[PDB]
Every structure is written in C-alpha cells, then in structure tokens.
Structure 1
Amino acid sequence: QAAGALVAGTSTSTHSVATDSTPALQAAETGATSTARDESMIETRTIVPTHGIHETSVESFFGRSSLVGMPLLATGTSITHWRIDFREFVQLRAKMSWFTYMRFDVEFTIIATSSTGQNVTTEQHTTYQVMYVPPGAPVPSNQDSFQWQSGCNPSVFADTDGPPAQFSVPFMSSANAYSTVYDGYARFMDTDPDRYGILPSNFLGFMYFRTLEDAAHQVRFRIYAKIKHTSCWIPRAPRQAPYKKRYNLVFSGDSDRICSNRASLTSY
C-alpha cells in the first residue's frame, strides 16, 4: 500500500485583457465555493508539485492512541468498570466532531499503575483481569463473583507491572456505521430529554476490572483507543464550545464569540 498522492502544482500565466472571461467574479449564493485559481488572478510562474497530503488523510488523522477511559480500582472492593464510549475525554471527542458517520476498528491499550492513599507511586505486582461484559450478561458484584469464570465473555489477563495489555476490536455496531450525532430518541413512546440524542447502537457494553487477589494498593487503569481502518461520511462544522456533559451537546455560551476582539477593524 503506497501513500504517494501529491498536492497540485502551478503553471505559468501571462497578462489577460478579456471582455468575456472574468474568473475573479463569483456568486456565492449558489452555495458553491469559488472557482478562481492562482493562475487566473496574477502572472504566475511554474511550480512542480512536491508536497504530499498523507498526514491529512482520514486514516492518519485518527490513527493514533488517545485516552478514552480511566477507571480507578479501590482496595476495599478490588473491582471497577468502564462504560464503553469515547465521550468521557475531550480531545478524541472533538476530533470525531468533524464527521457525522464513522465506520472503524479499534485498538485498545491498557496501562495499569499502583499508588498509595496520597496518590504516590508504589510497587505492586498482581494479575488483573479485564472482562468484556456485553448488554444482557450478568455483572460481577465482587472480586469473588462467579461471573469472572469467563465461560463466554472474553477476558484479558496481564500483570500490574508488566507490559501494557493490547488488543483489536472489529466494527461492532448493529448499524452500518457509528453516528457521532443523533437527532432522534432512544425509545418509542418516550420523549424524555435524557433520551434525546442517545443512539443505543453505539453502546456495546462495559469493561469490568478486578485484581486476581484482593488489592493491597490503589491501581488505576488508563485505557487508550486507536481508531484504525476508518471510513468517514458527511463532514460537520466542528465543535467550538467546550463540552459540559458526557451524553449531550449542551454548552455555556456566555459571550457569543469564538475569536479574539480588537479595538478597530482598521488596525491590529
């Protein structure tokens, strides 16, 4: 697979003195973007295309790991979980805001770190279990619970102090692509605001964590997600206001402006 597509070039131009051909004159009402090229506006020289465009490709744009979850396992219970979304942290969420529909695979990498009550690093070696709990499967209640047998649910076991755990996931939606946005309701005969903009087809379940023996120290799980094998459809005006909640788009919007203000439009 080769990534050698180039940007466009420039060819030489000369003076125009035409009473018919006028490319400088547009009509934006049509909804069409300007048709004018450098060559038709100034006398231009020749420039051979030498610049690549791979770093702006949909694959390269999303193809790197980002923090998406960060559950904390307490010593008293020795068990936490994480609802599988990409809505908890802003950086990735805002990257996805550029598109309406996205179909892709995911590569998860999990890094475990032990700490003290005062949140300072400590040495702790145990084995933890990450179990995928899909909708309908029974949830574990304790570090002891029988649900950890993992007869059908898939599980990953790794050491607290060993290399990060890592695995890939296919495109799982019941739909044909995930939706970053949804102008509709989650249920029929229900019109509750908490159910507006919620598309259940994007929620594949939870990830449950536990240590194989009662935990001596804290243990925090950092879950990283790499979007790969990406297909995107219908670009959107990206998010400009900050995110306040995880499941909706509400914003503060105090001052109705995005860029900086200045004294005059005629001076900097």
Structure 2
Amino acid sequence: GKMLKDAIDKQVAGALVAGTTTSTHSVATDSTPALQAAETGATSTARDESMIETRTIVPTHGIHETSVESFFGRSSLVGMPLLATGTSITHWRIDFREFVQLRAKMSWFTYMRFDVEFTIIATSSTGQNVTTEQHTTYQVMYVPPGAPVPSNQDSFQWQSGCNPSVFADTDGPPAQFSVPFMSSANAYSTVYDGYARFMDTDPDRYGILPSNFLGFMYFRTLEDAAHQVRFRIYAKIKHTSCWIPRAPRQAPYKKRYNLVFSGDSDRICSNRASLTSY
C-alpha cells in the first residue's frame, strides 16, 4: 500500500571517490599548475594528472564512512549516575560533556542539528563493586526545566502525570528511546562566545548557552534498593545536520562547562632531535 510506502524511505550510499585520467608530459610556458599562492586562503588546485604522468583509474571507493551521519551515527557513553542504597535516587544532567570521546567528535563543528537514541544499561553491584543479583524495576523520569525535582524515592513527583517516564527492569533488556531535535534554537551549539544572561558577565556564565540544556533525567528504583545500581547512559546521534567546521580539540578536556586547558608545553606532535632525519 501507498500508506505503508509513507513509512519506508529508500536511501542510497553510492557516492564514489574521484577517479584518475591518464596524462602525458607537458613542456610549455602556457600551463603552470604547480605555482600556487597560499596567501589568498584558497587550497591548492593542482591535481595528480597535472604534476606527473598518470594512468587512468576508475573510481571504486565509497565515501560513506565519513559522511556526518556515519561519523556520529553510533552510540557513546554520556552519563554514568550511581544509585546508592541510602536514598535509592540519583539523576544525570543531560548534555554530552562528561565523557570526552563524543565531546571531541562534536568539536569538529559549530552548530549541529540532530535526533538522539538513548540507551540505558543498569548494573547492580555490591559495596565492593562486585556484580550481584538484584531484580527490580527502575524509573527514569525526564524532568524539564521548571518541573519540581523528586527529593526521595517515594516522592509523589514520580507520579509522572506530565513528565515522560520509562520503566524497565535492572536485569532485563536495556531501555531505549528516541528524541527529536529539542532546542529552542534552530541548531545546537558546540561552542558559545557569549554570556548566559543579560546584565551579568560572571566568568561562570561565559560560554554557557542555556538553549543546549533540556533538563534532567531522574532515577529511582521502585522499591528501596538492596544494592547500588549503576546506570550507563548511551547516546547515538542521528538524522544529523552539521555546519561550520572547526579546528578540533587538541588539548585534553578539563572541565564540563568550559574549554579550559593546561597549555604548559605548546606542542601536539612528538619531538625529534633533527629535522633532516627521523
């Protein structure tokens, strides 16, 4: 049926890399492809065929593993809240900045528009952190800014009449759910050269764009936990638009909410004793 045709999108990865045309020797004063001028800011236009004698090469290699979708389109850890047994409650602030691998991958772009698939793995363990048996339901509640936060395991906030929740078992399959692009802005921002507030220039609000922050995930067990639970929160970025590539992060990350780095030794690649030998 055509109605089911609406739920199917045929999508194709068949873009190839550029090929090579055979070329011959050139002795002239007409064509000088090797002479360049980096001052313009343009990258060199010279190609293989104009610099040496080439054979013909039919293109066969795909480019799809470096499409922005493929590069971001896998799951990565973004949150690891620990539910202790004293209160049986925990939360994770929602952003991709606690764990460095996804953050550094995002640092190649300025603005990014995407959806998210979240995946939550819960693991129970003892005080000495050895795996242990515990079968219990847990509740993950999305708490958006301005909604009252639960303060206990039995708080009546966990009613969840308006906050969305997911209920799953600690020893069941992983909870998984998708999320549309939720920013009030038309993209997310990986970096922000401004202040979070008018009438304020506190350093702690520099580089803080609050339209990236959609709130909190809160976690309880539905009864009081017998053992601590660790939730691992994975995000896969999908349906991805990217704008304005950047110099990628090179210094290690130090803080969650700013770009501070050490910068004690100004170098990235390793040293050698002489430029004319390895």
CA offsets 1:61-107 (integer angstroms, 9 cap, x no match) = 00000000000001010000000010000000000000000000000
CA offsets 1:43-65 (integer angstroms, 9 cap, x no match) = 00000001000000000000000
Question: Secondary structure at the residue paired with 1:16?
Answer: coil
CA offsets 1:154-200 (integer angstroms, 9 cap, x no match) = 00000000000000000000000000000000000000000000000
TM-score when normalising by structure 1 = 1.00
CA offsets 1:94-150 (integer angstroms, 9 cap, x no match) = 000000000000000000000001000000000000000000100000001000000
Cα distance between partner residues in 2 of 1:82 and 1:262: 45
Cα distance between partner residues in 2 of 1:131 and 1:43: 65
Residue 227 (structure 1) aligned with residue 237 (structure 2): yes
Cα distance between partner residues in 2 of 1:253 and 1:181: 19
Question: Secondary structure at the residue paired with 1:60?
Answer: helix
1:247 to 257, 261, 278: 257
Question: Secondary structure at the residue paired with 1:91?
Answer: helix
Cα distance between partner residues in 1 of 2:29 and 2:76: 56
2:61 to 51, 64, 70: 51
CA offsets 1:14-34 (integer angstroms, 9 cap, x no match) = 010111210000000000000
Question: Secondary structure at the residue paired with 1:114?
Answer: strand
Deviation at 1:254, TM superposition (A): 1.2
CA offsets 1:187-214 (integer angstroms, 9 cap, x no match) = 0000000000000000000000000000
CA offsets 1:241-260 (integer angstroms, 9 cap, x no match) = 00000000000011100001
Q: Which stretch shifts more, 15-24 or 161-170?
A: 15-24
Cα distance between partner residues in 1 of 2:100 and 2:28: 53
Runs of 4+ in 1 over 4 A off after TM superposition: none
Q: What is the match of residue 60 of structure 1?
A: 70
Question: Secondary structure at the residue paired with 2:118?
Answer: strand
TM-score when normalising by structure 2 = 0.96
What residue ranges of structure 1 are gaps of 5+ in the alignment?
Answer: none
Question: Secondary structure at the residue paired with 1:121?
Answer: coil
Coordinate RMSD, CA, aligned: 0.3
Cα distance between partner residues in 2 of 1:37 and 1:265: 28
What residue ranges of structure 2 are gaps of 5+ in the alignment?
Answer: 1-10
Identity of aligned residues (%): 99
Deviation at 1:11, TM superposition (A): 0.6
Q: What is the match of residue 119 of structure 1?
A: 129
Cα distance between partner residues in 2 of 1:59 and 1:258: 28
Deviation at 1:6, TM superposition (A): 0.1
